Design a binder for these strands. Structure first.
Lengths: 178, 50, 50
DNA sequence: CCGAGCAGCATCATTACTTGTGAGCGGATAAC
DNA sequence: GTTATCCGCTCACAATGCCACACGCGCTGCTCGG
């Protein structure tokens, strides 16, 4: 009853995807699916409709690394080191890697449930920063966000109208810097 | 008798072969991953490194 | 005298010895040392005297 | 779609005859 | 065994000054960008 643990291997700067591909391909090559459970590359999908990048954006939990459900053995070890573009086994001493803890797996998977559940636009806003308005009704004016909302997403923002400052309910789509 | 000269020709073909082994590795891996018989023997190589 | 000094006496032991020697900090296994050796020499690809 | 910018890369084995000297360290070698 | 002794090996550290002239000095599949 060989329980395949979870290990992590260093990928390269901009190679992670094709690395995971080639990994599964070499698994199929040696038919060692029993030894290699799943190659996990967690990611994130931050969604903004305008502001350059539009309607989506793809982040990752952490670059340069790939997560595998391998089982520990020298054969599997070289099977992962006989791949195009990886570094050694991220962990303890080389040729004797350190499987990541189960708590790590559980926490990361809770992270994945959270991120995949709600498409959460990052580059968020903080109550107290000043910001302009690129929208028709208040073109190029500038006030301070007095409250940030996410579901309603309507930027309670104090701005100067008729002398007295007053809140305004303009949406994210028209905010300036910050 | 122990020190041979080496012209521009041999050195040039040597640099050729050296720049060639890397595209050899690359085309080997691209032939490995990619579809075996769906292509024309015209793009699996990248002559830019050569 | 050298055989007196000789640490190993077995062939596969010799391969794992040279495997550690050339590149330390790595898993000394039979196939890995064998590949390293018979591709350090005997390899028309990674070697050619001239 | 496709051109222009861009973000972190040993890009396998990338090897590499000395140069001459000094200092230090891990380990053989011997005294108590 | 201890205890120090010394030794083989490793690694750091130095390489005339000027000049002059010449040549050259990110990239590459991700990022963005409309």
């Amino acid at each position: 009853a060989p329980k395949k643990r979870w290990y992590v291997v260093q990928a390269f700067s901009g190679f992670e995807g094709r690395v995971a591909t080639s990994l599964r391909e070499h698994i199929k090559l040696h038919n060692m699916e029993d030894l290699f459970g799943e190659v996990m590359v967690p990611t994130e999908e931050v969604v903004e409709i305008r502001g350059g990048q539009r309607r989506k954006s793809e982040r990752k939990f952490f670059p340069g690394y790939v997560l595998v459900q391998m089982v520990m053995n020298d054969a599997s070890w070289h099977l992962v080191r006989s791949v195009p573009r990886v570094m050694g086994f991220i962990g303890g001493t080389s040729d004797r890697p350190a499987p990541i803890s189960d708590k790590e797996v559980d926490a990361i998977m809770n992270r994945l449930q959270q991120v995949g559940d709600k498409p959460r636009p990052k580059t968020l806003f903080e109550p107290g920063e000043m910001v302009r308005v690129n929208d028709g009704p208040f073109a190029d004016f500038n006030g301070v966000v007095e409250e940030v909302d996410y579901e309603k997403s309507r930027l309670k923002v104090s701005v100067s109208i008729f002398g007295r400052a007053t809140p305004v309910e303009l949406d994210f789509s028209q905010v300036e810097k910050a | 008798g122990n020190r041979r000269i080496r012209s521009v020709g041999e050195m040039a073909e040597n640099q050729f072969r050296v720049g060639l082994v890397r595209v050899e590795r690359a085309v080997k891996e691209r032939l490995s991953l990619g579809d075996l018989d769906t292509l024309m023997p015209q793009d699996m190589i990248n002559a830019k490194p050569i | 005298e050298t055989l007196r000094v000789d640490p190993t006496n077995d062939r596969l032991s010799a391969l794992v010895e040279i495997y550690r020697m050339m590149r330390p900090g790595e898993p000394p296994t039979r196939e890995a040392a064998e590949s390293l050796f018979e591709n350090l020499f005997f390899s028309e690809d990674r070697y050619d005297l001239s």
